Amino acid sequence: SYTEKKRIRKDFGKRPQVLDVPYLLSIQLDSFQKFIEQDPEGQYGLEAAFRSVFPIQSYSGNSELQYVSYRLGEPVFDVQECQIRGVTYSAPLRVKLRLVIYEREAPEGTVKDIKEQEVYMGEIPLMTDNGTFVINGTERVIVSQLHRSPGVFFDSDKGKTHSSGKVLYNARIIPYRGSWLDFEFDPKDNLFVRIDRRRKLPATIILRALNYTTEQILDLFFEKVIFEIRDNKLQMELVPERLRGETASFDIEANGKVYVEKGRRITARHIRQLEKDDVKLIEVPVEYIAGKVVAKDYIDESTGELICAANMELSLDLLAKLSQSGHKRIETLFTNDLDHGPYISETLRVDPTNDRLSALVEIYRMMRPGEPPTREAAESLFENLFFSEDRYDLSAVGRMKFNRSLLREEIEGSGILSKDDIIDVMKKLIDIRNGKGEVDDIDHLGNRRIRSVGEMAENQFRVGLVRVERAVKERLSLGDLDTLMPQDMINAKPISAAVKEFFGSSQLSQFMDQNNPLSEITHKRRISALGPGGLTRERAGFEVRDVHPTHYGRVCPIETPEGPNIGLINSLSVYAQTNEYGFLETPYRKVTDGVVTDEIHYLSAIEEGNYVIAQANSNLDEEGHFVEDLVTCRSKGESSLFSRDQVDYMDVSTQQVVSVGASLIPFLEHDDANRALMGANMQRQAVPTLRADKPLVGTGMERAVAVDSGVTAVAKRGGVVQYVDASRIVIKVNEDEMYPGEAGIDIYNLTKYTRSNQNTCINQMPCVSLGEPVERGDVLADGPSTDLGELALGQNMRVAFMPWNGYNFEDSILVSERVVQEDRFTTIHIQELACVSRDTKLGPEEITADIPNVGEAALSKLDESGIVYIGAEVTGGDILVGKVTPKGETQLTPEEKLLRAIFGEKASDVKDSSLRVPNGVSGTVIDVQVFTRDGVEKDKRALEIEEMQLKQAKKDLSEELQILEAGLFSRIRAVLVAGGVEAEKLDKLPRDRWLELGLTDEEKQNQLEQLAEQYDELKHEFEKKLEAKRRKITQGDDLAPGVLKIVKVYLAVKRRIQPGDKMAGRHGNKGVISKINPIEDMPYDENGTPVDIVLNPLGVPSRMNIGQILETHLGMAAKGIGDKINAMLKQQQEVAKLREFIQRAYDLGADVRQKVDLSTFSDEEVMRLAENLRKGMPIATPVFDGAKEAEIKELLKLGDLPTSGQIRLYDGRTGEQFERPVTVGYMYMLKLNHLVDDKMHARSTGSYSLVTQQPLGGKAQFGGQRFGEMEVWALEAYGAAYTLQEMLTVKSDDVNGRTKMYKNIVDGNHQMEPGMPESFNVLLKEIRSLGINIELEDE
């Protein structure tokens, strides 16, 4: 490595890593890859959405539209151009279509007219190289969603009929799209049906709609006990395995042996008796069948009348009629009280319909009520509900879960439902009602899949595609045929409108958090339970907001918001993947015969619930087996002890449970989870400061986050560095990585002082030097808050834990003045103000420096063209750009007539409406961008900005042509030395004139002339690129309708810390700065070094975040090692002393896995390493794999510091000594984005709301603090009647009272005269406009 040889973090983890941390943005990039990518058959994304609707026939069938292929054009602008211009970053969608015409005058007139032109179906916004979308110039992130998977889920309730406290089992079939279908039960044990949660029908209505009679329903849902009547005494063929524990209605009989007596219940020994005798027929008394229900339709075969139908309780006269009619063999259903219930019998008795047509009009009367139901209308509705692919789909994940839950075998199948599926769901629900089987776990991670950005945009594309497919089928039905192109009938409005509506304003298209790189990467790895198809925030219970045991390795349990969003927004764990179906999976190492191998299996949520999986904190040796016998494991939800050979899997790493941000906390295992949650939250709100500062106590996940966030500049191809700048890095590639048709020069253009979404600063500082060799995959430029490729959100602060005079009372923080002097937590806040020149109907506005009735002091900051200079330090109430507005003539006086006569300013009354900087805001001006529309000549200032951009682009294209002609002349040198041997005669002459040298005409001469004309056409495409760039920056902008030109002004403020600024560590220890104490007042030790920050010790033993204290002690040790290395470097000892001491500090831990050896390090690298270590040696500490207190004390003993962690501090002011030793060390503090510059607000009088005449709300529009209902109650409890009347009237919506109060206060007479608040008159007028006469009755 090369960026790692310059500063190596000491690792304290004792376990090896058999699987590295993957690419942290594989979920977003892979989902959009599967959406946008061209696949032949494994249907994904755009090709699947095209095949789902194409082809389409006519209203008759005389023409149809075939889809051939689609492609995507090149985007018109790169990502930085879209972010500058304020347009989305999209691509044109060009798709080849085929239009054929069926000659209906012919029997099969296939070929009449074949059209194949290129059609333009809207635009799709592309995803950049970091996983974000640029929509209208701003940067968004489409958060993944966690919804219920399609399929069937047999759930239940828990005591909803409290008249009995019974359970009421219910199924629910969830399609991907289409009408839901829910079977359920009642307290009277009847199967019901709701379609789309509508009114309850009996559940045999759907069966009779499926063309099933009562007989076939009974055969499907019951079994037959067969009865034969012989010489007027009844006999029953009895299978003995139908009688469990119940009493006998009669003394049972066999051929010659009595087994079970009357009044004697039948035992399992009696079951063994009746299977060991193997009897078949058993005679039965008359009253035993009085209670059975006939399952067969029976008619008197002599005459032809219905004697008894199916499902009717037979009687004595009915059995006499069945004996005398000739039907001497009856089939009744077998029922029971315990298991085989009479549910379907009772639903057939409740069931009022009788045939297919009556059930169909019952379904139509339920679905589209208040209409006359007809036969074909009810038939077409019932077909289109479930059994038609154009209005119902399971999309094969629902089919997988369906066959999985019905215990089937075949995975793939029909997307639509069918009769076997419906009767299988009813049979399984009846099995649940029996007792064989179990209900499903609703909050399982096998019932909840992940619907990512590519799937969601595919569905919105399909919605737009059917919305345009309907209209193009309508047009193809009635239009002409010979001249009908596909282009004028395909309309790009619905598809582009739907996909732009989704990408711009869905509930899952979120404005990306851009505080630090951890903010953006945690947003891009986020999982939302809300959105379209998911839950809602207000009506979600505690069961969805809990840590299910299947979250181990897939979803983080300690990273989530802490408000009303707590269980509903989750975070993906570090190693978590998805299936092809969308279920979360996490890797495990397969153990075989005790040997834990290095084979990695990604197990999904349901597969891991079978095996025994070892913990990652179980001990291994010699790459062998476990060191103990009673090993912990987890299986089937719970976690208990197991043997060392029974185990099936092991966790791949110790950080497998926690997310990205929760695995940056050192000593996380010593933290309470309520504080670790808040630390993982508050790391994402930390502003990037002026100079980045790596944590001395870290995790080693910092380099992974800093590289994978895309916020740095990583090297695409390794080599050596040719030229560094503040804004450019030029890398000469090695010839091995160089391709045989190029030069081998990469250019990196660093983005400098770009604004983030949270108005913070983004700039890339180059971390390499001149002539330094790099490799492929090292960091070239530190981003906003990274330091040498490590994540650096804050600074390392010398922290003392003691109470200091009540200045750290209740989570407060006392800060030295050296932290404010040295500018450690000083952040830059870039802020963009805009000024739009619009076309008023009274006259067009103009942006010119000529501003009326203002003083010439404010005109010094503007230029002669009306725009402020780059670099001018503006303040509040100043002017940035002078835009005046035509007020309007509206009068004809001789004064204005003489004015328009003498000057010609025909709108000589103008209203100055210039853009002014809002109050309380300051800072310089770092960037001015002026956009203009077509036709209007722009300005001198816009010409100057245009010339500067033109010169910059021309310099970039000139360097591009220089390196490309260098590579081409290297290629002609290579083919010249391949053809002949000419070395001195080619380089004794200049390289640009390498074309006039020649020889005899041969293959190499032909190659010389062909590369000559290739260099000529290279010059041709070079000047074509120049002309394209020139016309692109000279063309007028595609601005909104109604504007003429837009001026954007960028400010930049530096915000030092102050009392009231919020500050936090990493363990959920937030605090507000209360005082900024001088260095002569801070406490110190006997070397005289004062402490940078004094924290409160009483915040520790209630919140139980002991990682605070352990990070303090390890930071004290690390800074002690850095102090000793700095002492040796300042004394300039040797290289051998430095090598010995740094080696002793490196190989220090107990049995740690890091083996660093400076024997291979050359002396310049050891001096470079000691220079980077002179401010403190950084120390890694993985989560749940930490450094012990023994290793902390060992490092403290190396650093010649106290072993117990505590030194003796002296008072800063009195010079005396604190009576106890005080814990002093180096915590890592962050500066959160809740600054008192943004919270502080005050208002005496301002603007008012229009309807209610009450003061506004908000610091942005200078609002008033809402004196709400609870404060009205508090004043009522005090008794302050005059203060309450003052609040309700004269500080509020009472107009005469508030004007008189202002002028009475200025008159020195503090007295109010109150009246009626105007919101009461608003209320009176609204109750009157409801047709209700309300009036204040006078006395």
Binding site: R368, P369, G370, E371, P372
Partner: peptide
Amino acid sequence: EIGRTTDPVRMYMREMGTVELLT
């Protein structure tokens, strides 16, 4: 059926669907 609806266009469609179409 008269009664169980509240959609006005559904009631209007039900009303207009009774008079027969001319030849």
